[PDB]
């Protein structure tokens, strides 16, 4: 028994709405800042309209297009809620409302073989700015569901040290050990709610710190897949659909 012996079982199942995700090579589960997603308290709220709480229609797993771990791969990132702004009813609720609040369950996938070696840092960063350019391009600050490739991994695209990104909720996908990372994230902001089309609360980054190598002749095509589920969401300020 994992609880009795004091260890974490390498298998896991994540079930939300009509979706179930499984892995047989996990490395525990991270819960950002030790906090599970929670509803907005009456004492913290300011918007007075009764909120919409979509439930299972939006709180389920959405799988984004996979990314290849190429030989020159520097890493890839996705902004939240930006990446899911046009997916399913989560996207619709995000567009039709001025205000949105919610947490996340992130599952990053990358399997190879016992003949491959490589290590990916999987980190969820609050308020992660892509500020390496004098005038950041919208295509890079809000890359959508396809996400964007890293150009400056060592400086974390924001002028800080990549090695210190561990101060943010994270896990590693070290091929010899695991093939997936799972992170539960609570809503974080200096406000009770905010606009899902003007502000990205979190940024998911998958960065190779130890390059992908393997026994000569092994499969060279190794994808990285991201599956994300909104959790405990609520929306206020209903109107027509509006995207950034």
């Amino acid at each position: 028994s994992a609880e009795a012996c004091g260890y974490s079982d390498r298998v896991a199942q994540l079930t939300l709405g009509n979706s179930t995700i499984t892995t047989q090579e996990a490395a525990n589960i991270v819960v950002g800042y030790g906090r599970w997603p929670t509803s907005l308290r009456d004492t913290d709220a300011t918007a007075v309209d009764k909120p919409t709480q979509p439930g299972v229609s939006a709180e389920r797993f959405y799988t984004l297009p996979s990314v290849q771990w190429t030989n020159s791969f520097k890493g890839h990132y996705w902004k939240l809620p930006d990446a899911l702004s046009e997916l399913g009813l989560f996207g619709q609720n995000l567009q039709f409302h001025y205000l949105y609040r919610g947490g996340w369950v992130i599952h990053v996938q990358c399997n190879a073989t016992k003949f491959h070696q490589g290590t990916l840092l999987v980190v969820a960063t609050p308020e992660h700015k892509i500020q390496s350019a004098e005038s950041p391009a919208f295509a890079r600050t809000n890359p959508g569901e396809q996400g964007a490739a890293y150009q400056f991994p060592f400086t974390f695209e924001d002028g800080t040290a990549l090695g210190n990104a561990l101060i943010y909720p994270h896990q590693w996908v070290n091929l010899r050990t695991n093939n997936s990372a799972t992170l539960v994230l609570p809503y974080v902001n200096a406000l009770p709610m905010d606009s899902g089309i003007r502000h990205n609360n979190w940024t998911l980054s998958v960065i190779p710190i130890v390059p992908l190598e393997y026994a000569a002749g092994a499969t060279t095509y190794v994808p990285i897949t991201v599956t994300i589920a909104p959790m405990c969401t609520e929306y206020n300020g209903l109107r027509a659909a509006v995207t950034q």
């Binding site: 950002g32 800042y33 030790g34 906090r35 929670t38 308290r41 004492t43 913290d44 016992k114 003949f115 491959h116 070696q117 490589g118 290590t119 609050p126 991994p153 060592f154 040290a161 990549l162 090695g163 210190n164 561990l166 101060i167 590693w172 070290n174 091929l175 010899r176 050990t177 609570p186 809503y187 974080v188 902001n189 200096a190 406000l191 009770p192 190779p208 710190i209 130890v210 190598e213 393997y214 026994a215 000569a216 002749g217």
Partner: protein, 243 residues
């Protein structure tokens, strides 16, 4: 009026002073404190979090590659893998870590240190390495035999990918200066010693496997660690007004 006698210090502006003063908006009522995850009350909470050491700080290593300790199949025994002074506040691999940055915001430190290492070779790649902490007195150990006489851990590569070598606080005084600057202050007095890594056996791999692999190095303060005397971080500077 009550007779008073004003004293030296009157009118001075000590940046660390702590007096009560009139408020610009005496009746102002701030927004409520809401529930936000991740509250931090003391930076000791931050330095206890592991971050990567920029250990391979050599000319041939650029960017991300500087975090990787090179390991390779040997054809000789007892060889060395790496070396580093354990002092958290001096220039070098430690300066860009979380622990290093905050230590550099202070003049003195104390406490045991957590150095954790994660092997990143293939599942089939094995090996045993010894990591040693050499308390001060002399120079870094010249060979494995000398190194193993100090505090150490023997690490076996396997399912549990990482190992921790605790560099226990072993010091004459309760605190050490964070710099070892010698020309002016002669602070080399405080050197905390060295951490070295050696092949215990060898890195071994199957046919046609990569004969080189990497180890990532993490460091953090232990629960008995503290810092004293705040000072400006030497890494932050400017030569003029900012655009």
């Amino acid at each position: 009026g009550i007779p008073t006698l004003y004293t030296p210090g009157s009118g001075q502006f000590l940046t660390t002073d702590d007096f009560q003063t009139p408020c610009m908006l005496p009746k102002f009522q701030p927004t409520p404190v809401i529930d936000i995850p991740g509250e931090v009350k003391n930076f000791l909470e931050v330095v206890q979090v592991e971050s990567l050491v920029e250990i391979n700080n050599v000319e041939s290593a650029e960017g991300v590659a500087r975090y990787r300790i090179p390991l390779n199949v040997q054809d000789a025994m007892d060889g060395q893998i790496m070396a580093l002074r354990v002092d958290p506040g001096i220039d070098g691999p430690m300066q860009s870590t979380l622990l290093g940055v905050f230590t550099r915001y202070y003049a003195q430190w104390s406490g045991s240190l957590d150095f954790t290492f994660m092997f990143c070779g293939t599942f089939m790649t094995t090996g045993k390495v010894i990591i040693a902490y050499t308390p001060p007195g002399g120079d870094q150990p010249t060979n494995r035999r000398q190194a193993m006489l100090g505090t150490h851990v023997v690490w076996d590569f396997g399912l549990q990918s990482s190992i921790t070598l605790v560099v226990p606080w072993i010091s004459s005084g309760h605190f050490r200066g964070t710099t070892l600057e010698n020309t002016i202050y002669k602070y080399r007095y405080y050197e905390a010693g060295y951490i070295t890594m050696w092949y215990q056996t060898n890195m071994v791999v199957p046919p046609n496997f990569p004969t080189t692999a990497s180890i990532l190095m993490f460091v953090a303060a232990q629960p008995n660690f503290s810092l004293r005397i705040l000072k400006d971080r030497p890494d932050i500077s400017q030569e003029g007004a900012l655009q």
